[PDB]
Motif scaffolding. Sequence first.
Motif, PDB file in Angstrom:
ATOM      1  N   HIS B 104      -1.084  -9.050  16.256  1.00  0.00           N
ATOM      2  CA  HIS B 104      -0.064  -9.863  15.609  1.00  0.00           C
ATOM      3  C   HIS B 104       1.042 -10.003  16.662  1.00  0.00           C
ATOM      4  CE1 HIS B 104      -2.241  -9.610  11.654  1.00  0.00           C
ATOM      5  NE2 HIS B 104      -2.343  -8.302  11.996  1.00  0.00           N
ATOM      6  N   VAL B 105       1.405  -8.808  17.322  1.00  0.00           N
ATOM      7  CA  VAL B 105       2.776  -8.928  18.342  1.00  0.00           C
ATOM      8  C   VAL B 105       2.148  -9.902  19.439  1.00  0.00           C
ATOM      9  CG1 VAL B 105       3.618  -6.808  17.421  1.00  0.00           C
ATOM     10  CG2 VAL B 105       2.223  -6.982  19.783  1.00  0.00           C
ATOM     11  N   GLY B 106       0.890 -10.013  19.890  1.00  0.00           N
ATOM     12  CA  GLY B 106       0.364 -10.775  20.844  1.00  0.00           C
ATOM     13  C   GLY B 106       0.523 -12.442  20.344  1.00  0.00           C
ATOM     14  N   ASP B 107       0.153 -12.541  19.248  1.00  0.00           N
ATOM     15  CA  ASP B 107       0.125 -13.987  18.593  1.00  0.00           C
ATOM     16  C   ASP B 107       1.682 -13.982  18.391  1.00  0.00           C
ATOM     17  OD1 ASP B 107      -2.434 -13.518  18.375  1.00  0.00           O
ATOM     18  OD2 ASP B 107      -2.539 -13.897  16.221  1.00  0.00           O
ATOM     19  N   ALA B 108       2.656 -13.344  18.114  1.00  0.00           N
ATOM     20  CA  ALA B 108       3.955 -13.776  18.114  1.00  0.00           C
ATOM     21  C   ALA B 108       4.720 -14.063  19.622  1.00  0.00           C
ATOM     22  CB  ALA B 108       4.892 -12.653  17.707  1.00  0.00           C
ATOM     23  N   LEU B 109       4.339 -13.358  20.589  1.00  0.00           N
ATOM     24  CA  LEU B 109       4.422 -13.607  21.926  1.00  0.00           C
ATOM     25  C   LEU B 109       3.871 -14.878  22.382  1.00  0.00           C
ATOM     26  CD1 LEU B 109       4.043 -10.036  23.532  1.00  0.00           C
ATOM     27  CD2 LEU B 109       6.224 -11.287  23.127  1.00  0.00           C
ATOM     28  N   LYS B 110       2.728 -15.253  21.853  1.00  0.00           N
ATOM     29  CA  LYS B 110       1.972 -16.547  22.255  1.00  0.00           C
ATOM     30  C   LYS B 110       2.545 -17.588  21.878  1.00  0.00           C
ATOM     31  CE  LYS B 110      -2.246 -15.506  22.368  1.00  0.00           C
ATOM     32  NZ  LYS B 110      -3.067 -14.888  23.349  1.00  0.00           N
ATOM     33  N   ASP B 111       3.437 -17.526  20.350  1.00  0.00           N
ATOM     34  CA  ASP B 111       3.859 -18.531  19.833  1.00  0.00           C
ATOM     35  C   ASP B 111       5.330 -18.689  20.559  1.00  0.00           C
ATOM     36  OD1 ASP B 111       1.846 -19.118  18.260  1.00  0.00           O
ATOM     37  OD2 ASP B 111       2.939 -17.881  16.541  1.00  0.00           O
ATOM     38  N   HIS B 112       6.064 -17.637  20.953  1.00  0.00           N
ATOM     39  CA  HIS B 112       7.275 -17.649  21.728  1.00  0.00           C
ATOM     40  C   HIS B 112       7.423 -18.204  23.004  1.00  0.00           C
ATOM     41  CE1 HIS B 112      10.656 -16.143  23.843  1.00  0.00           C
ATOM     42  NE2 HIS B 112       9.863 -15.362  24.699  1.00  0.00           N
ATOM     43  N   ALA B 113       6.268 -17.851  23.912  1.00  0.00           N
ATOM     44  CA  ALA B 113       6.365 -18.393  25.210  1.00  0.00           C
ATOM     45  C   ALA B 113       6.128 -19.895  25.457  1.00  0.00           C
ATOM     46  CB  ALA B 113       4.935 -17.823  25.845  1.00  0.00           C
ATOM     47  N   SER B 114       5.306 -20.451  24.489  1.00  0.00           N
ATOM     48  CA  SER B 114       5.222 -22.087  24.514  1.00  0.00           C
ATOM     49  C   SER B 114       6.366 -22.693  24.076  1.00  0.00           C
ATOM     50  CB  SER B 114       4.021 -22.344  23.758  1.00  0.00           C
ATOM     51  OG  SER B 114       2.722 -21.585  24.089  1.00  0.00           O
ATOM     52  N   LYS B 115       7.505 -22.244  23.440  1.00  0.00           N
ATOM     53  CA  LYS B 115       8.633 -22.822  22.939  1.00  0.00           C
ATOM     54  C   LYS B 115       9.948 -22.464  23.116  1.00  0.00           C
ATOM     55  CE  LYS B 115       5.679 -23.258  18.701  1.00  0.00           C
ATOM     56  NZ  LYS B 115       5.685 -23.088  17.137  1.00  0.00           N
ATOM     57  N   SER B 116       9.992 -21.642  24.333  1.00  0.00           N
ATOM     58  CA  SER B 116      11.298 -21.007  24.941  1.00  0.00           C
ATOM     59  C   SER B 116      11.389 -20.743  26.315  1.00  0.00           C
ATOM     60  CB  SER B 116      11.808 -19.949  23.702  1.00  0.00           C
ATOM     61  OG  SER B 116      10.914 -18.697  23.772  1.00  0.00           O
ATOM     62  N   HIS B 163       0.952  -9.148  27.672  1.00  0.00           N
ATOM     63  CA  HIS B 163       1.673  -7.828  27.809  1.00  0.00           C
ATOM     64  C   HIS B 163       2.012  -7.826  29.309  1.00  0.00           C
ATOM     65  CE1 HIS B 163       0.906  -6.385  23.915  1.00  0.00           C
ATOM     66  NE2 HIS B 163       1.165  -5.018  24.207  1.00  0.00           N
ATOM     67  N   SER B 164       3.560  -7.523  29.340  1.00  0.00           N
ATOM     68  CA  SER B 164       4.053  -7.753  30.838  1.00  0.00           C
ATOM     69  C   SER B 164       3.595  -6.352  31.509  1.00  0.00           C
ATOM     70  CB  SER B 164       5.650  -7.747  30.696  1.00  0.00           C
ATOM     71  OG  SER B 164       6.133  -8.778  30.024  1.00  0.00           O
ATOM     72  N   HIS B 165       3.549  -5.299  31.217  1.00  0.00           N
ATOM     73  CA  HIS B 165       3.090  -4.171  31.939  1.00  0.00           C
ATOM     74  C   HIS B 165       2.075  -3.211  31.005  1.00  0.00           C
ATOM     75  CE1 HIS B 165       6.949  -5.686  33.527  1.00  0.00           C
ATOM     76  NE2 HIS B 165       6.596  -5.187  34.503  1.00  0.00           N
ATOM     77  N   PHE B 166       1.350  -2.310  31.926  1.00  0.00           N
ATOM     78  CA  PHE B 166       0.492  -1.415  31.274  1.00  0.00           C
ATOM     79  C   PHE B 166       0.635   0.058  32.118  1.00  0.00           C
ATOM     80  CE2 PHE B 166      -1.890  -5.377  30.088  1.00  0.00           C
ATOM     81  CZ  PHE B 166      -1.822  -5.250  28.753  1.00  0.00           C
ATOM     82  N   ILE B 167       0.369   1.083  31.125  1.00  0.00           N
ATOM     83  CA  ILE B 167       0.603   2.468  31.485  1.00  0.00           C
ATOM     84  C   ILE B 167      -0.888   3.108  31.023  1.00  0.00           C
ATOM     85  CG2 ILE B 167       1.740   4.912  31.810  1.00  0.00           C
ATOM     86  CD1 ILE B 167       4.162   3.513  32.004  1.00  0.00           C
TER      87      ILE B 167
END
Lengths: 141, 354
Positions: B104-116, B163-167
């Motif tokens: 769900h947070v990935g989908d939210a980021l998906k919507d955010h990146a295309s509109k801002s 996701h910007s980074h992974f550990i």
Amino acid sequence: ITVFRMGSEGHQDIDLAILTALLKGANASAPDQLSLALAWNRVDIARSQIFIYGQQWPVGSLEQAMLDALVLDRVDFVKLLIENGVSMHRFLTISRLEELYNTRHGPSNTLYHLVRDVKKGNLPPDYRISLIDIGLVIEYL
Amino acid sequence: ISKHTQLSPTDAFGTIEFQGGGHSNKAMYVRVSFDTKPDLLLHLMTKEWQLELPKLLISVHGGLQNFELQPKLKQVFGKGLIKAAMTTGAWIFTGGVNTGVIRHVGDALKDHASKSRGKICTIGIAPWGIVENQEDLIGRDVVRPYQTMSNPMSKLTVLNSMHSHFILADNGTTGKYGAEVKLRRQLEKHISLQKINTRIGQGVPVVALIVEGGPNVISIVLEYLRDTPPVPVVVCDGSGRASDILAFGHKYSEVTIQKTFTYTRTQAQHLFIILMECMKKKELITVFRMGSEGHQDIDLAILTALLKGANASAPDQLSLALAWNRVDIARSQIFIYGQQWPVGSLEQAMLDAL
């Protein structure tokens, strides 16, 4: 049997009601529904009805769907399949590109006339176009 | 064995580009062990990845099961989370794999990146053994493609894009959960202790967001509440799982037959001990509901929790609002009827704002 009503039913549109009956009523797999939607040129139906939670697509079905959509000039279906895991770096090969260059399910083009002119009018009827002929045409153009 | 492994240096650190999705995202990835000290990880994040210290830290927890959310609830949640993470400089900690709330947070980021414009720093801390393709991630300081397409029979979950980074945390086992919670908790605790640029003395605030969840979520929220610096908790009632039962217990608090929900061993098993501890420390817990009460916006709900949950004076709240560059919050929450400001606080605030 699929009843219709303007109230509680989500499918208040008979246009949506008729098409959804043919999908669930066929009891067919996801590739068959996708092929039917591609034939009907309805991308919203595929987006809403077909691509859902856990469709467990078989191996290689999406690449075949992309190959079928490319030759039919279905841009929205290509975009939808790209959005659903299909990658062009692994899909595209020499054989698939040659099959694309020898399709007939689209608007008329003038490629064959250019190929014949480049080959000095020596190609036989029902000729198989290869990538070298395309390269020669590109160099000429 | 008793975690008998070989302490060899890492052989996987670099950048991965996801092939298969509709966007082009680059994620820096580094694999480490679960015994890595938080200070070294913070140094790596601040220097190697070039990430400045945040002014807010959001911890997202949820049910690892692949559930579903009601439409118009996953939209307002996404909008609120994105606005809260974008208006100020904040970090988001998630599991990393593409299951549960992380989808769900990935989908939210998906919507955010295309509109801002702008970028949001989302960090995924996932176990190394669960990634579907452990190989093809070995090229050190090089770019290696990654396939987003997954199949059910692999028994493994692919890393979530956007996701910007992974550990990646490894302990030796493969294909098992439960090898990164302690590292994540210690990293959060060490980041909180770090001092923000303000001279008041405030540290980096921490908040927790709960969606769905399960039996472990009650223990996690109890642990968060019992911490010496209390951590405010935000709960979504419409999820359905133990978050919904937490909201149910939040109302008409200080009911055992009504508590029996068969989510555990019938009525023979009751979580009343931990549930009543949570409801005893219920002043910090904050709930959310679409239109039933106030704070219908997730963005407003998260920020207000950090103000009243800190139990700090008006100058401290004003300093936090000034750091976040949120003037509406200060106008509505801070400047209210009779704040009895100390002598000289407003002049210092003006000097800091100039």
